[PDB]
């Protein structure tokens, strides 16, 4: 077994955010942790992006600090696999490196990883770092500049259940303040940390008792001094003999999860809350402290972190919803909100379910996820590519160029060109334009003029004009009537293409030395000659500007493009990179989308070039073939005119992205999704929270509360507290309007949904597996399977089947209904009397959470006993247990690759693949599935499904969605291919600088607490694709063994076209 994993969509949810002076002393930065990605911003007046890096680990801890005599702040990061590091920001010119000041692994092999997980704290005097990794221990990294491998000592903590810790301000020796739990209740203790005697001395105040659910500790800075303990009913201040205690009624009805210091002295603090409310915590000084106050600011999305920036701007980082930038206002709005959203950052959120549909009924798939939870939950329609919306398309053939023409604002005209002819449209020619003063330019097959010779190549801007007659060049300037000739030169070879985008320079492509050159203007002299190599001439050339940097672009006739870094004064060409895009010669052209200039490349793979991370990205236009193009305003405004081989077209263009995400808000948690094509609509399980009434109500309007048809369950089988109310939503495939909502019984959860046909019945049903859920019980002892048909307009209940457990999973199986009922797998048949009757079942489970099928085979993913393989023996009408993996993997998602190969995600962020052993002594060696591939993903996988986002060397294609919003892809490799990739996997590790100097082999190693094996049968496509973004000096370090660097570009490129 040989698999290749790669990322289709990087993780979107926010684990952490921190604010400080990281890039410079005078810059104010926002640092954001997504899972393995670290984002770095500068605060403007918005956010200017500077650097996004990736690490080889889940970032568990991230805080800035500044040692004595340090120019700017240093960054401390700790990963979940226990990699510690200190990073510095160094920007020596055009280049930016996150350089590793110190690094080390701080794991012990004796250890209970705790509830509340990792906690990472730094001392105010920056003398020390404190970690709580395991119960009863406390690890200490002493921060003198000598300790560069980050060697650490442990102190033993007699408190075996710690909730939160902080270092305090204003303490002689360094002092930790923490809330712990024994019986008796929860308490606050303080220890001082001796660095030289190495263990705990006793602290300032004595041990006080706090609230049963006291959960957060804020350390107030020195003007005040103590610690604030946040709990569910009360906020309290503690300092020695000082104790203030407010218990405001507002904060009762939801839990506070995050906080942030707003005013540096500590007078004001932001509080975030599980239902999305934002609070200000106000310390009123009198340098005593008289009172605490809580004021409600407004609603945000549900905050995982909070960070005040400058000037009333708060960044709200979410993991259950979109992240946002919001403005805090002195004055309330018309509804009492001091909060106002400025910007919103898409989080594909917890992906809890997804399916692949060819919605726009062409050949390209779209993902449709269940995203988010509570009021942030939504569907996301995810489409690959950049689409263009047609508004008119004249069926006109030929066409070898077009231009737009503007005396005020609007574009008005649109000029075409054909062999030797030229038609002009408002319903041969080289250029058409609007130039200085008045008049427009027009350049024909021969002359605007020279000495009976034919112009062969043209170029122009607002004020200057360069034409080429054979190898001769001329320099024209536009003056208040007709064009005065400036310069004259002859090139050593024939001119192929020409650009002068503004003008002190001139880009030129020549005919026999395959050259691209920069020439001074007017001098025409040669500032830089670059040999492109090869034996195909350039077809278009172009200089432009992407995100403040300058570039040269030269399309060759074989569809390759080159791009360099332009100087604009020196004219030097730097950092040659080469991108394949299509097979026929590309025509380059600039256009504007937002306030950015991009480039439209026209080949049989139309592409838009732009700049994301100050690197250039190439993204496909979802069009068959484009030959010419230009921007319009005349079809009408803000548009693109595009000619293909055999007709024209005009229209608008999508956001310039790799992925298009349409978002459908629901204001409740969606839980499962499935497409029913004959009804052209979607079934979505969702739940909403309602609260014990004065009699159950509903906190806000939701998708189920505002459907466009309702119904409520009819069934008489089972004859301020909160509670989930579940529904099946019917969702129009085109408008995504919620057509119908059916509500289930009180305390019934819908956990599983299918859309299938059954038996010889010609109807297509929605089938819902449910469970009766009471917090008292451990597992459910009652649930039901319900058979709905979407008739027209409304849902009617066709069948019902009571069962003795939760229906965790269901799947259509060969005309029958396979189901998991709470540690039993069962097979139902569909009678002519419209009824489910049992056929067989299987009880050798602990909790069958996950089913998938293929032919007569069934993959069963268990709560804790890993995976097992079942068969339906169709003659005997039975289940046959074929084999089983005998490892203690706690499953999250499961998928069948082929009939011999089964894929699985476990709750430790690992992937494995199981095979059928093809060995002798069948009865036991063939009853054991062998793990044949291991790989640490770093993500928790909720769903696999078969399908692909792409199609308008590898085999098969499985997408997966994760809690952190990353969408991933798995595919199969030939053995020829895996060994080659595995090879240059290890060559790339020797060359790629890893942030924190974490080793890639360690990162991807399979890791539980039972065992830690290295990864096998698995290729990290993220790592293989990083080959395209390194030096060519370092590329050649990676080609020592007949191979050439330009050859592996081809291989790695072909693999990027996979997602």
């Amino acid at each position: 077994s040989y698999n290749y994993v790669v990322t289709a969509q990087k993780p979107t949810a926010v684990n952490g955010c921190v604010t400080g002076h990281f890039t410079s002393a005078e810059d104010l930065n926002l640092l954001i942790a997504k899972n393995t990605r670290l984002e770095i911003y500068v605060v403007t007046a918005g956010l200017r992006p500077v650097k996004e890096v990736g690490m080889y680990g889940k970032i568990a801890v991230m805080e800035l600090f500044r040692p004595k005599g340090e120019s700017k702040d240093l960054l401390f990061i700790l990963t979940a696999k226990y990699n510690a590091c200190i990073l510095e920001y160094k920007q020596s010119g055009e280049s930016i490196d996150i350089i590793t000041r110190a690094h080390g692994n701080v794991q012990d092999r004796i250890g209970r990883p705790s509830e509340t997980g990792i906690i990472g704290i730094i001392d105010p005097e920056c003398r020390m770092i404190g970690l709580r990794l395991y119960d009863g221990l406390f690890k200490v990294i002493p921060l003198d500049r000598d300790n560069k491998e980050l060697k650490a000592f442990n102190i033993r903590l007699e408190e075996l259940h710690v909730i939160d810790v902080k270092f305090l301000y204003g303490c002689q020796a360094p002092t930790i303040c923490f809330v712990y739990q024994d019986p008796q209740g929860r308490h606050v203790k303080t220890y001082e940390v001796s660095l030289r005697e190495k263990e705990f001395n006793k602290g300032p105040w004595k041990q006080e008792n706090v609230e049963a659910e006291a959960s957060m500790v804020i350390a107030v800075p020195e003007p005040f001094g103590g610690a604030i303990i946040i709990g569910q009913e009360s906020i309290t201040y503690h300092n020695g003999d000082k104790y203030l205690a407010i218990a405001p009624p507002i904060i009762k009805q939801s839990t506070i999860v995050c906080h942030n210091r707003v005013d540096p002295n500590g007078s004001r603090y932001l509080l975030g809350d599980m239902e999305g409310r934002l609070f200000m915590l106000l310390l009123e000084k009198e340098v005593t402290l008289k009172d605490l106050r809580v004021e409600l600011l407004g609603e945000t999305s549900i905050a995982e972190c909070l960070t005040y920036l400058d000037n009333g701007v708060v960044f709200v980082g979410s993991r259950l919803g979109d992240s946002q930038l919001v403005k805090l206002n002195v004055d309330s709005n018309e509804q009492g909100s001091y909060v106002v959203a400025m910007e919103t950052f898409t989080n594909l959120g917890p992906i809890v379910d997804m399916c692949v549909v060819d919605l726009e009924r062409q050949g390209q798939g779209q993902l449709v996820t269940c995203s988010g939870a509570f009021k942030e939950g939504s569907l996301r329609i995810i489409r690959n590519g950049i689409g263009i919306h047609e508004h008119a398309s004249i069926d006109l053939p030929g066409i070898k160029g077009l231009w737009p023409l503007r005396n005020r604002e609007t574009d008005d005209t649109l000029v075409l060109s054909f062999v030797g002819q030229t038609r002009v449209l408002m319903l041969q020619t080289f250029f058409c334009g609007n130039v200085a003063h008045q008049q427009l330019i027009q350049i024909t097959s021969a002359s605007v003029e020279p000495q009976a010779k034919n112009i062969s190549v043209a170029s122009c801007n607002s004020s200057q004009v360069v034409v080429a007659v054979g190898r001769a060049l001329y320099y024209l300037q536009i003056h208040p009537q007709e064009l005065r000739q400036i310069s004259h030169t002859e090139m050593e070879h024939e001119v192929a293409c020409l650009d002068i985008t503004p003008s002190p320079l001139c880009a030129i492509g020549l005919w026999t030395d395959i050259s691209a050159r920069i020439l001074k203007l007017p001098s025409f002299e040669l500032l830089h000659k670059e040999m492109l190599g090869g034996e195909i001439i350039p077809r278009s050339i172009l200089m432009t500007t992407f995100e403040s940097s300058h570039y040269l672009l030269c399309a060759l006739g074989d569809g390759a493009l080159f791009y360099f870094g332009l100087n604009i004064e020196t004219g030097l060409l730097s950092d040659r990179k080469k991108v394949t895009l299509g097979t026929q010669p590309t025509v380059l052209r600039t256009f504007r989308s937002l306030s950015t200039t991009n480039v439209f490349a026209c080949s049989d793979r139309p592409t838009v070039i732009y700049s994301s991370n100050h690197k250039l990205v190439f993204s496909n236009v979802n069009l068959k073939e484009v030959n010419y193009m230009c921007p319009l305003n005349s079809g009408y405004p803000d548009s693109l005119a595009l000619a293909n081989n055999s007709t024209l077209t005009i229209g608008t263009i999508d956001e310039i992205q790799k992925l298009h995400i349409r978002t459908v808000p629901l204001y409740e948690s969606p839980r499962k999704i499935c497409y029913q094509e004959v009804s052209q609509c979607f079934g979505v399980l969702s739940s909403r929270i309602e609260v014990q009434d004065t009699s159950t109500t509903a906190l806000r309007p939701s998708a189920s509360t505002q459907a466009l048809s309702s119904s409520v369950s009819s069934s008489k089988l089972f004859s301020g507290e909160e509670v989930e109310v579940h529904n099946l939503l019917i969702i129009d495939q085109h408008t995504f309007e919620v057509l119908h909502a059916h509500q289930f019984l009180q305390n019934e959860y819908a956990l599983s949904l299918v859309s299938c046909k059954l038996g010889k019945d010609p109807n297509t049903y929605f089938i819902v597996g449910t469970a009766m859920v009471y917090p008292e019980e451990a597992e459910p002892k009652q649930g039901r399977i319900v058979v709905f048909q979407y008739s027209d307009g409304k849902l009617q209940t066709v069948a019902e089947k009571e069962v003795k457990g939760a229906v965790y999973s269901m799947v259509e199986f060969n005309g029958k209904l396979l189901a998991s009922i709470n540690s039993t797998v069962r097979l139902y048949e569909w009678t002519t009397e419209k009824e489910l009757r049992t056929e067989c079942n299987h009880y050798n489970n602990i909790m069958a959470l996950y089913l998938k099928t293929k032919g007569d085979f069934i993959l069963v993913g268990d709560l804790m006993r890993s995976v097992l393989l079942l068969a339906y023996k169709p003659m005997e009408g039975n289940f046959e247990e074929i084999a089983r993996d005998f490892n203690p993997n706690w499953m999250s998602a499961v998928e069948i690759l082929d009939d011999d190969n089964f894929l699985g995600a476990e709750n430790a962020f690992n992937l494995f693949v199981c095979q059928k052993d093809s060995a002798a002594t069948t009865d036991e060696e063939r009853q054991h599935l062998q793990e044949v591939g291991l790989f640490h993903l770093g993500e928790f996988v909720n769903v696999f499904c078969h399908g692909s986002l792409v199609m308008q060397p590898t085999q098969g294609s499985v997408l997966f969605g994760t809690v952190n919003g990353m969408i991933g892809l798995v595919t199969s490799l030939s053995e020829s291919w895996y060994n080659l990739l595995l090879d240059m996997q290890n060559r790339l590790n020797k060359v790629i600088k890893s942030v924190g100097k974490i080793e890639h082999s360690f990162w991807r190693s399979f890791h539980t607490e039972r065992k830690t094996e290295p990864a096998t049968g698995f290729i990290d496509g993220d790592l293989i694709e990083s080959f395209l973004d390194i030096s060519r000096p370092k590329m050649q370090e990676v080609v020592a063994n007949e191979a050439t660097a330009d050859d592996l570009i081809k291989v790695v490129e072909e693999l990027t076209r996979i997602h």
Partner: peptide, 13 residues
């Protein structure tokens, strides 16, 4: 309760 624990875990709540 397993169902809620599971529902929570899928959120990683």
């Amino acid at each position: 309760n397993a169902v809620q624990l599971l529902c929570a875990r899928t959120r990683d709540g």
